[PDB]
């Protein structure tokens, strides 16, 4: 039940700052050093910084020396990372990692930090109703015209998980993203069971819950 | 910095067959205390990395016995005796003997399986989007192998190119298939200029091309 | 040299 939960990701203008958090549970946070690792979209893993169990010593990667600062609050079991003077090269998914088993034994889920000079645009959720229907029908939602990445798409507030295929976003010709999230469900539940898609675009603060009704 | 070189970049292995991933370091990873601090990481699609092996060959908590580790010094190998469906993703080697912690580039493990035919569903644009002036027709291809497929948009029985974008999912961890969505975005004026909207799919599983169509009425 | 697996953790 060792679980690491990160937060603080979003979009930031070049030169500005952003602070990430990492909640630790299931172990004694005060006696383990911590790491920060990042992964650019489609690229590999790159170490960022390490902090001692008490914050007495700190080591940084050469690419982030002088801009990133690692810290921790053992009274909260939380690991922090202040990122100043951000660049488009710093766009990546950032992980915190616990030391253990002579390796990085446990990781957080990852949070996305994007550095872009483009305006933030909220999405517009459109329903994909089941009509053409053997006993397994398909329905979904359309998250269209948003920027930047990402969007959190869940079904039935997280209750519907099987058969879901959230497609990767595609950069349209208008510089805006648009993905689709579908789910195959038994045809006997198109009217007995209610299906709602939950969309959340963090950079624009837009939470949309849209019901996908059938289409006879 | 110790340079980690992983080979190859992609490995197409058949289901149930053994697989092996090599990792090479620029220096010896044996520390001053005589312990080789090399680890193997597994990153499933859309998930964080999880620890498979530490200190070359030691298995982490809840790691299946089919994952194995060998090699010593500067050459290392991660071996899977039976490749299963949960084994999809990228694998990274990591050193923790020096403090500039360096990772490998990664080895993507693609799983070869039998042919699977795609499930073709078409979705007309919503009336809510029609009020916005735009209209998007989605063509869904669900659970198919291999990844190669061709989706052709025929608006009013006329091949259309240039107004459609596609998105293929990653290989699934339950059936090792793929899913594809093709969105044809047109204006409402151009949408009401035609009647029959169809997407024709050709796949290795499909003997004859499958066409899903709807009319604006 | 330092041990990244032992030094950043609490001393036994």
CSV table of C-alpha atoms in Angstrom, one decimal:
chain,number,residue,atom,x,y,z
A,1,UNK,CA,0.0,0.0,0.0
A,2,UNK,CA,3.0,2.3,-0.7
A,3,UNK,CA,1.5,5.1,-2.8
A,4,UNK,CA,3.0,8.3,-4.2
A,5,UNK,CA,0.6,11.1,-5.4
A,6,UNK,CA,1.9,14.1,-7.4
A,7,UNK,CA,0.2,17.4,-8.1
A,8,UNK,CA,1.0,20.9,-9.5
A,9,UNK,CA,1.2,20.3,-13.2
A,10,UNK,CA,-0.1,22.6,-15.9
A,11,UNK,CA,0.9,25.2,-18.4
A,12,UNK,CA,3.4,27.9,-17.9
A,13,UNK,CA,4.8,30.8,-20.0
A,14,UNK,CA,8.6,30.7,-20.8
A,15,UNK,CA,10.7,32.2,-18.0
A,16,UNK,CA,8.0,31.8,-15.4
A,17,UNK,CA,7.8,29.3,-12.5
A,18,UNK,CA,5.9,26.2,-11.3
A,19,UNK,CA,6.0,24.1,-8.1
A,20,UNK,CA,5.3,20.4,-7.9
A,21,UNK,CA,4.2,18.3,-4.9
A,22,UNK,CA,4.4,14.6,-4.1
A,23,UNK,CA,2.4,13.0,-1.3
A,24,UNK,CA,4.0,9.9,0.2
A,25,UNK,CA,2.2,7.1,2.2
A,26,UNK,CA,2.8,3.6,3.2
A,27,UNK,CA,6.4,4.1,4.5
A,28,UNK,CA,8.4,6.4,6.8
A,29,UNK,CA,9.0,9.4,4.7
A,30,UNK,CA,11.5,10.9,7.1
A,31,UNK,CA,14.1,8.1,6.7
A,32,UNK,CA,14.2,7.8,2.9
A,33,UNK,CA,15.9,10.1,0.4
A,34,UNK,CA,13.8,11.1,-2.6
A,35,UNK,CA,14.4,11.7,-6.3
A,36,UNK,CA,12.8,13.7,-9.1
A,37,UNK,CA,12.7,12.1,-12.6
A,38,UNK,CA,11.2,13.6,-15.7
A,39,UNK,CA,10.2,12.1,-19.1
A,40,UNK,CA,9.6,14.2,-22.2
A,41,UNK,CA,6.7,13.1,-24.5
A,42,UNK,CA,7.9,10.1,-26.4
A,43,UNK,CA,11.4,10.3,-25.0
A,44,UNK,CA,13.3,8.5,-22.2
A,45,UNK,CA,13.8,9.0,-18.5
A,46,UNK,CA,16.1,11.7,-17.1
A,47,UNK,CA,17.2,12.2,-13.5
A,48,UNK,CA,16.6,15.7,-12.1
A,49,UNK,CA,17.5,15.9,-8.4
A,50,UNK,CA,17.9,14.0,-5.2
A,51,UNK,CA,17.4,15.1,-1.6
A,52,UNK,CA,18.6,13.5,1.6
A,53,UNK,CA,16.2,12.1,4.2
A,54,UNK,CA,16.5,15.3,6.3
A,55,UNK,CA,17.2,17.8,3.5
A,56,UNK,CA,20.8,18.2,4.7
A,57,UNK,CA,22.3,17.6,1.3
A,58,UNK,CA,21.0,18.0,-2.3
A,59,UNK,CA,22.3,17.1,-5.7
A,60,UNK,CA,21.0,18.4,-9.0
A,61,UNK,CA,21.4,17.4,-12.7
A,62,UNK,CA,23.7,19.8,-14.6
A,63,UNK,CA,20.9,20.7,-17.0
A,64,UNK,CA,18.8,22.1,-14.0
A,65,UNK,CA,21.5,23.5,-11.7
A,66,UNK,CA,20.7,27.0,-10.8
A,67,UNK,CA,17.0,26.8,-11.8
A,68,UNK,CA,15.4,23.9,-10.0
A,69,UNK,CA,15.3,23.5,-6.2
A,70,UNK,CA,14.3,20.3,-4.4
A,71,UNK,CA,12.8,20.4,-1.0
A,72,UNK,CA,10.7,18.4,1.5
A,73,UNK,CA,8.4,18.8,4.4
A,74,UNK,CA,8.6,15.7,6.6
A,75,UNK,CA,5.7,17.0,8.8
A,76,UNK,CA,3.5,16.6,5.7
A,77,UNK,CA,5.2,13.6,4.0
A,78,UNK,CA,5.5,15.8,0.9
A,79,UNK,CA,8.3,16.2,-1.6
A,80,UNK,CA,8.5,19.5,-3.5
A,81,UNK,CA,10.3,20.8,-6.6
A,82,UNK,CA,10.4,24.6,-7.5
A,83,UNK,CA,11.1,25.2,-11.2
A,84,UNK,CA,12.2,28.7,-12.0
A,85,UNK,CA,13.3,30.1,-15.4
A,86,UNK,CA,11.4,27.3,-17.2
A,87,UNK,CA,12.1,26.5,-20.9
A,88,UNK,CA,10.4,24.6,-23.6
A,89,UNK,CA,13.1,22.0,-23.0
A,90,UNK,CA,11.6,21.4,-19.5
A,91,UNK,CA,8.3,20.2,-21.0
A,92,UNK,CA,8.0,16.7,-19.6
A,93,UNK,CA,6.1,14.3,-17.2
A,94,UNK,CA,7.7,14.7,-13.8
A,95,UNK,CA,8.0,11.8,-11.4
A,96,UNK,CA,9.0,11.6,-7.8
A,97,UNK,CA,10.8,8.4,-6.7
A,98,UNK,CA,11.4,6.8,-3.4
A,99,UNK,CA,14.8,5.2,-2.6
A,100,UNK,CA,14.6,1.5,-1.8
A,101,UNK,CA,15.9,-2.0,-2.7
A,102,UNK,CA,19.1,-0.4,-4.0
A,103,UNK,CA,17.0,1.4,-6.8
A,104,UNK,CA,14.0,3.6,-7.2
A,105,UNK,CA,11.5,1.2,-5.8
A,106,UNK,CA,8.3,3.2,-5.9
A,107,UNK,CA,7.2,6.0,-8.3
A,108,UNK,CA,4.3,8.5,-8.4
A,109,UNK,CA,1.8,8.6,-11.2
A,110,UNK,CA,3.4,11.5,-13.0
A,111,UNK,CA,2.4,15.1,-13.6
A,112,UNK,CA,2.7,17.0,-16.9
A,113,UNK,CA,4.4,20.4,-17.1
A,114,UNK,CA,4.1,22.2,-20.5
A,115,UNK,CA,6.0,25.4,-21.4
A,116,UNK,CA,4.3,27.2,-24.2
A,117,UNK,CA,3.7,30.8,-25.4
A,118,UNK,CA,0.2,29.9,-26.7
A,119,UNK,CA,-3.1,30.9,-25.2
A,120,UNK,CA,-5.0,28.5,-23.0
A,121,UNK,CA,-8.3,27.3,-24.6
A,122,UNK,CA,-10.9,25.2,-22.9
A,123,UNK,CA,-12.4,22.1,-24.6
A,124,UNK,CA,-16.0,21.5,-25.8
A,125,UNK,CA,-17.5,18.1,-25.0
A,126,UNK,CA,-19.7,16.5,-27.6
A,127,UNK,CA,-21.5,13.1,-27.3
A,128,UNK,CA,-21.0,10.1,-29.5
A,129,UNK,CA,-24.3,8.3,-29.3
A,130,UNK,CA,-24.7,4.5,-29.9
A,131,UNK,CA,-27.0,4.0,-32.9
A,132,UNK,CA,-25.5,1.5,-35.4
A,133,UNK,CA,-25.1,-1.1,-32.6
A,134,UNK,CA,-23.3,-8.1,-31.9
A,135,UNK,CA,-24.7,-7.6,-28.4
A,136,UNK,CA,-22.0,-5.1,-27.6
A,137,UNK,CA,-22.6,-1.4,-28.5
A,138,UNK,CA,-20.1,1.4,-28.5
A,139,UNK,CA,-20.5,5.0,-27.3
A,140,UNK,CA,-18.1,7.8,-26.4
A,141,UNK,CA,-17.3,11.5,-26.0
A,142,UNK,CA,-15.5,14.1,-28.1
A,143,UNK,CA,-13.1,16.5,-26.4
A,144,UNK,CA,-12.5,19.0,-29.2
A,145,UNK,CA,-10.6,22.3,-29.6
A,146,UNK,CA,-8.5,22.6,-26.5
A,147,UNK,CA,-5.0,23.6,-25.6
A,148,UNK,CA,-2.7,22.5,-24.0
A,149,UNK,CA,-2.3,18.9,-23.0
A,150,UNK,CA,-3.8,17.1,-21.2
A,151,UNK,CA,-7.4,16.3,-20.5
A,152,UNK,CA,-8.7,13.8,-17.9
A,153,UNK,CA,-11.5,11.7,-19.3
A,154,UNK,CA,-13.2,9.2,-17.0
A,155,UNK,CA,-16.5,7.3,-17.3
A,156,UNK,CA,-19.3,7.2,-14.7
A,157,UNK,CA,-17.0,9.2,-12.3
A,158,UNK,CA,-14.5,6.4,-12.5
A,159,UNK,CA,-16.8,3.4,-12.1
A,160,UNK,CA,-16.7,2.3,-15.7
A,161,UNK,CA,-13.1,1.2,-16.5
A,162,UNK,CA,-13.3,-1.9,-18.7
A,163,UNK,CA,-13.6,-1.6,-22.4
A,164,UNK,CA,-12.5,2.1,-22.4
A,165,UNK,CA,-10.1,3.3,-25.1
A,166,UNK,CA,-9.1,6.9,-24.6
A,167,UNK,CA,-7.4,7.8,-27.9
A,168,UNK,CA,-4.3,10.0,-28.0
A,169,UNK,CA,-4.8,13.6,-28.7
A,170,UNK,CA,-4.2,14.9,-32.3
A,171,UNK,CA,-2.9,18.4,-33.0
A,172,UNK,CA,-5.4,19.9,-35.5
A,173,UNK,CA,-4.5,22.4,-38.2
A,174,UNK,CA,-5.7,25.2,-35.8
A,175,UNK,CA,-3.0,24.4,-33.2
A,176,UNK,CA,-5.6,22.9,-30.9
A,177,UNK,CA,-5.9,19.3,-29.7
A,178,UNK,CA,-8.9,17.0,-30.1
A,179,UNK,CA,-9.2,13.4,-28.8
A,180,UNK,CA,-12.0,10.8,-28.5
A,181,UNK,CA,-12.8,8.4,-25.6
A,182,UNK,CA,-15.1,5.5,-26.4
A,183,UNK,CA,-16.2,2.5,-24.4
A,184,UNK,CA,-17.8,-0.8,-25.5
A,185,UNK,CA,-20.7,-1.8,-23.3
A,186,UNK,CA,-23.2,-4.7,-23.5
A,187,UNK,CA,-26.2,-3.8,-25.7
A,188,UNK,CA,-28.6,-4.8,-22.9
A,189,UNK,CA,-27.5,-1.8,-20.8
A,190,UNK,CA,-27.9,1.0,-23.3
A,191,UNK,CA,-31.0,2.2,-21.4
A,192,UNK,CA,-30.8,0.4,-18.1
A,193,UNK,CA,-27.4,1.8,-17.3
A,194,UNK,CA,-26.5,5.5,-17.5
A,195,UNK,CA,-23.2,6.4,-19.1
A,196,UNK,CA,-21.6,9.8,-18.3
A,197,UNK,CA,-18.1,11.0,-19.4
A,198,UNK,CA,-16.2,13.2,-17.0
A,199,UNK,CA,-13.9,15.7,-18.7
A,200,UNK,CA,-11.4,17.9,-16.8
A,201,UNK,CA,-9.0,20.3,-18.5
A,202,UNK,CA,-6.7,21.5,-15.7
A,203,UNK,CA,-5.0,24.5,-17.5
A,204,UNK,CA,-8.4,26.1,-18.2
A,205,UNK,CA,-10.3,25.0,-15.1
A,206,UNK,CA,-13.2,23.4,-17.0
A,207,UNK,CA,-15.0,20.3,-15.6
A,208,UNK,CA,-17.7,19.0,-17.8
A,209,UNK,CA,-19.9,15.9,-17.1
A,210,UNK,CA,-22.0,15.0,-20.2
A,211,UNK,CA,-24.5,12.2,-20.4
A,212,UNK,CA,-24.2,10.1,-23.6
A,213,UNK,CA,-27.8,9.0,-24.4
A,214,UNK,CA,-28.6,6.3,-27.0
A,215,UNK,CA,-29.8,7.2,-30.5
A,216,UNK,CA,-32.6,5.1,-31.9
B,1,UNK,CA,28.4,10.5,-16.3
B,2,UNK,CA,28.1,6.8,-17.0
B,3,UNK,CA,26.5,6.2,-20.4
B,4,UNK,CA,23.8,3.5,-20.6
B,5,UNK,CA,23.3,2.0,-24.0
B,6,UNK,CA,20.2,-0.2,-24.5
B,7,UNK,CA,19.8,-2.4,-27.6
B,8,UNK,CA,17.7,-2.6,-29.5
B,9,UNK,CA,15.1,0.1,-29.7
B,10,UNK,CA,12.2,-2.2,-30.6
B,11,UNK,CA,11.7,-6.0,-30.1
B,12,UNK,CA,8.8,-7.8,-31.9
B,13,UNK,CA,8.4,-11.0,-29.9
B,14,UNK,CA,5.6,-13.5,-30.2
B,15,UNK,CA,3.2,-14.3,-27.4
B,16,UNK,CA,4.6,-17.0,-25.1
B,17,UNK,CA,8.1,-16.8,-26.6
B,18,UNK,CA,11.2,-15.8,-24.6
B,19,UNK,CA,12.6,-12.3,-24.9
B,20,UNK,CA,15.8,-10.7,-23.8
B,21,UNK,CA,16.9,-7.0,-23.5
B,22,UNK,CA,20.6,-5.9,-23.4
B,23,UNK,CA,22.1,-3.0,-21.5
B,24,UNK,CA,25.7,-1.8,-21.6
B,25,UNK,CA,27.4,0.8,-19.4
B,26,UNK,CA,30.4,3.0,-20.2
B,27,UNK,CA,32.0,2.0,-17.0
B,28,UNK,CA,31.8,-0.8,-14.4
B,29,UNK,CA,28.7,-0.6,-12.3
B,30,UNK,CA,30.3,-2.5,-9.4
B,31,UNK,CA,30.5,-0.1,-6.5
B,32,UNK,CA,33.3,0.2,-4.0
B,33,UNK,CA,31.4,-2.2,-1.7
B,34,UNK,CA,31.4,-4.8,-4.4
B,35,UNK,CA,27.7,-4.5,-5.3
B,36,UNK,CA,26.5,-3.9,-8.9
B,37,UNK,CA,23.8,-1.2,-8.7
B,38,UNK,CA,21.9,-1.9,-11.9
B,39,UNK,CA,18.2,-2.0,-12.0
B,40,UNK,CA,15.5,-2.9,-14.6
B,41,UNK,CA,12.4,-0.9,-15.0
B,42,UNK,CA,9.1,-1.6,-16.7
B,43,UNK,CA,6.8,1.2,-18.0
B,44,UNK,CA,3.5,-0.1,-19.3
B,45,UNK,CA,1.7,2.2,-21.8
B,46,UNK,CA,0.4,5.3,-20.0
B,47,UNK,CA,1.7,4.2,-16.6
B,48,UNK,CA,4.7,5.1,-14.4
B,49,UNK,CA,7.7,2.9,-14.3
B,50,UNK,CA,7.8,0.0,-11.9
B,51,UNK,CA,10.8,-1.8,-10.5
B,52,UNK,CA,11.4,-5.3,-11.9
B,53,UNK,CA,15.0,-6.2,-10.9
B,54,UNK,CA,17.5,-4.6,-8.6
B,55,UNK,CA,21.2,-5.5,-8.2
B,56,UNK,CA,21.3,-7.3,-11.6
B,57,UNK,CA,19.2,-10.3,-10.7
B,58,UNK,CA,17.2,-9.8,-7.5
B,59,UNK,CA,13.4,-9.7,-8.1
B,60,UNK,CA,11.3,-7.0,-6.5
B,61,UNK,CA,8.0,-7.4,-4.6
B,62,UNK,CA,5.3,-9.1,-6.6
B,63,UNK,CA,7.5,-9.6,-9.7
B,64,UNK,CA,6.8,-12.8,-11.6
B,65,UNK,CA,9.6,-15.5,-11.7
B,66,UNK,CA,9.6,-15.4,-15.5
B,67,UNK,CA,11.5,-12.1,-15.3
B,68,UNK,CA,15.2,-12.9,-14.9
B,69,UNK,CA,18.5,-10.9,-14.7
B,70,UNK,CA,22.0,-11.8,-15.7
B,71,UNK,CA,25.3,-10.2,-16.9
B,72,UNK,CA,27.9,-8.6,-14.6
B,73,UNK,CA,30.3,-5.6,-14.8
B,74,UNK,CA,29.3,-3.6,-17.9
B,75,UNK,CA,27.0,-6.0,-19.9
B,76,UNK,CA,23.5,-6.9,-18.6
B,77,UNK,CA,20.5,-8.8,-19.9
B,78,UNK,CA,16.9,-8.8,-18.8
B,79,UNK,CA,15.2,-12.1,-19.8
B,80,UNK,CA,11.5,-13.1,-19.9
B,81,UNK,CA,10.9,-16.8,-20.2
B,82,UNK,CA,7.3,-16.5,-21.4
B,83,UNK,CA,6.1,-13.1,-22.9
B,84,UNK,CA,2.6,-12.4,-21.6
B,85,UNK,CA,0.1,-9.7,-22.4
B,86,UNK,CA,1.0,-7.6,-19.4
B,87,UNK,CA,4.6,-7.3,-20.6
B,88,UNK,CA,3.9,-4.6,-23.2
B,89,UNK,CA,5.8,-1.3,-22.8
B,90,UNK,CA,9.2,0.2,-22.7
B,91,UNK,CA,12.0,-1.3,-20.4
B,92,UNK,CA,14.7,0.9,-18.9
B,93,UNK,CA,18.0,0.0,-17.2
B,94,UNK,CA,19.2,2.3,-14.5
B,95,UNK,CA,22.5,2.7,-12.6
B,96,UNK,CA,22.7,4.0,-9.0
B,97,UNK,CA,26.5,3.5,-8.4
B,98,UNK,CA,27.3,7.1,-9.3
B,99,UNK,CA,25.3,10.1,-8.4
B,100,UNK,CA,24.7,11.5,-11.8
B,101,UNK,CA,21.9,8.9,-12.1
B,102,UNK,CA,21.7,7.9,-15.7
B,103,UNK,CA,19.0,5.8,-17.5
B,104,UNK,CA,19.0,3.9,-20.7
B,105,UNK,CA,17.2,5.0,-23.9
B,106,UNK,CA,14.7,2.2,-23.4
B,107,UNK,CA,13.7,-1.0,-25.3
B,108,UNK,CA,10.1,-1.1,-26.6
B,109,UNK,CA,8.6,-4.6,-26.4
B,110,UNK,CA,6.0,-5.2,-29.0
B,111,UNK,CA,3.9,-8.4,-28.8
B,112,UNK,CA,3.1,-10.5,-31.9
B,113,UNK,CA,-0.2,-12.4,-31.8
B,114,UNK,CA,-2.8,-13.8,-34.2
B,115,UNK,CA,-4.9,-11.7,-36.5
B,116,UNK,CA,-7.8,-9.8,-35.0
B,117,UNK,CA,-10.5,-8.1,-37.1
B,118,UNK,CA,-11.4,-4.5,-36.3
B,119,UNK,CA,-14.9,-3.6,-35.0
B,120,UNK,CA,-16.1,-0.7,-37.3
B,121,UNK,CA,-18.5,1.8,-35.8
B,122,UNK,CA,-19.4,5.2,-37.2
B,123,UNK,CA,-20.8,8.1,-35.2
B,124,UNK,CA,-22.6,11.1,-36.9
B,125,UNK,CA,-22.0,14.6,-35.6
B,126,UNK,CA,-24.0,15.7,-32.6
B,127,UNK,CA,-26.6,18.4,-33.0
B,128,UNK,CA,-24.8,20.4,-30.3
B,129,UNK,CA,-21.7,20.6,-32.5
B,130,UNK,CA,-24.0,21.5,-35.5
B,131,UNK,CA,-25.0,24.6,-33.6
B,132,UNK,CA,-21.3,25.5,-33.3
B,133,UNK,CA,-20.9,25.6,-37.1
B,134,UNK,CA,-18.6,22.6,-37.1
B,135,UNK,CA,-19.3,18.9,-37.6
B,136,UNK,CA,-17.1,15.8,-36.8
B,137,UNK,CA,-17.8,12.3,-38.1
B,138,UNK,CA,-15.9,9.6,-36.1
B,139,UNK,CA,-15.0,6.2,-37.5
B,140,UNK,CA,-14.0,3.7,-34.7
B,141,UNK,CA,-11.9,0.7,-35.3
B,142,UNK,CA,-11.8,-1.4,-32.1
B,143,UNK,CA,-9.4,-4.2,-31.1
B,144,UNK,CA,-7.5,-5.3,-34.1
B,145,UNK,CA,-4.1,-6.8,-34.9
B,146,UNK,CA,-1.8,-6.0,-36.6
B,147,UNK,CA,-1.6,-2.2,-36.3
B,148,UNK,CA,-1.6,-1.6,-40.1
B,149,UNK,CA,-5.0,-0.5,-41.4
B,150,UNK,CA,-6.5,1.8,-44.0
B,151,UNK,CA,-9.6,3.9,-43.4
B,152,UNK,CA,-11.0,5.7,-46.4
B,153,UNK,CA,-13.6,8.5,-46.1
B,154,UNK,CA,-16.1,8.5,-48.9
B,155,UNK,CA,-18.5,11.4,-48.6
B,156,UNK,CA,-21.5,11.0,-50.9
B,157,UNK,CA,-19.6,8.1,-52.5
B,158,UNK,CA,-16.6,10.3,-53.3
B,159,UNK,CA,-13.2,9.6,-51.9
B,160,UNK,CA,-12.2,12.5,-49.5
B,161,UNK,CA,-8.6,13.2,-48.4
B,162,UNK,CA,-7.2,16.1,-46.4
B,163,UNK,CA,-10.1,16.6,-43.9
B,164,UNK,CA,-9.4,13.6,-41.6
B,165,UNK,CA,-7.0,13.0,-38.8
B,166,UNK,CA,-6.4,9.6,-37.1
B,167,UNK,CA,-5.3,8.4,-33.7
B,168,UNK,CA,-4.1,4.9,-32.9
B,169,UNK,CA,-3.9,3.6,-29.3
B,170,UNK,CA,-1.0,1.7,-27.9
B,171,UNK,CA,-0.9,-2.1,-27.7
B,172,UNK,CA,-3.3,-3.4,-25.1
B,173,UNK,CA,-2.2,-5.2,-21.9
B,174,UNK,CA,-5.2,-7.6,-22.0
B,175,UNK,CA,-5.4,-8.7,-25.6
B,176,UNK,CA,-2.4,-7.1,-27.3
B,177,UNK,CA,-4.5,-5.4,-30.0
B,178,UNK,CA,-4.9,-1.8,-31.3
B,179,UNK,CA,-7.8,0.6,-31.6
B,180,UNK,CA,-8.1,3.4,-34.2
B,181,UNK,CA,-10.3,6.5,-34.5
B,182,UNK,CA,-10.6,8.7,-37.6
B,183,UNK,CA,-12.3,12.1,-37.3
B,184,UNK,CA,-13.5,13.9,-40.4
B,185,UNK,CA,-14.1,17.5,-39.5
B,186,UNK,CA,-16.2,19.6,-41.9
B,187,UNK,CA,-18.1,22.8,-41.7
B,188,UNK,CA,-21.9,22.7,-41.2
B,189,UNK,CA,-22.4,24.2,-44.7
B,190,UNK,CA,-20.2,21.6,-46.2
B,191,UNK,CA,-21.8,18.9,-44.0
B,192,UNK,CA,-25.2,19.7,-45.4
B,193,UNK,CA,-24.0,19.6,-49.0
B,194,UNK,CA,-23.9,15.8,-49.1
B,195,UNK,CA,-26.1,12.9,-47.8
B,196,UNK,CA,-24.1,9.6,-47.5
B,197,UNK,CA,-21.2,9.6,-45.1
B,198,UNK,CA,-19.2,6.4,-45.0
B,199,UNK,CA,-15.8,5.2,-43.9
B,200,UNK,CA,-14.4,2.1,-45.7
B,201,UNK,CA,-12.0,-0.1,-43.7
B,202,UNK,CA,-9.5,-2.6,-45.1
B,203,UNK,CA,-7.6,-4.9,-42.7
B,204,UNK,CA,-5.8,-8.2,-42.9
B,205,UNK,CA,-8.5,-9.9,-40.8
B,206,UNK,CA,-11.3,-8.5,-43.0
B,207,UNK,CA,-11.7,-10.7,-46.1
B,208,UNK,CA,-13.7,-7.9,-47.8
B,209,UNK,CA,-13.7,-4.2,-47.0
B,210,UNK,CA,-16.2,-3.3,-44.3
B,211,UNK,CA,-18.1,0.0,-44.8
B,212,UNK,CA,-20.2,1.7,-42.1
B,213,UNK,CA,-22.4,4.5,-43.5
B,214,UNK,CA,-25.2,6.8,-42.3
B,215,UNK,CA,-27.3,9.4,-44.0
B,216,UNK,CA,-27.8,13.0,-42.8
B,217,UNK,CA,-31.5,12.2,-42.4
C,1,UNK,CA,32.6,8.4,-3.9
C,2,UNK,CA,29.1,8.2,-2.5
C,3,UNK,CA,26.5,5.5,-2.4
C,4,UNK,CA,23.3,6.9,-3.9
C,5,UNK,CA,21.4,3.9,-2.3
C,6,UNK,CA,22.7,4.3,1.3
C,7,UNK,CA,23.9,7.9,1.8
C,8,UNK,CA,20.6,9.8,1.0
C,9,UNK,CA,18.7,7.5,3.4
C,10,UNK,CA,18.7,7.7,7.2
C,11,UNK,CA,21.9,6.3,8.8
C,12,UNK,CA,21.2,2.9,10.5
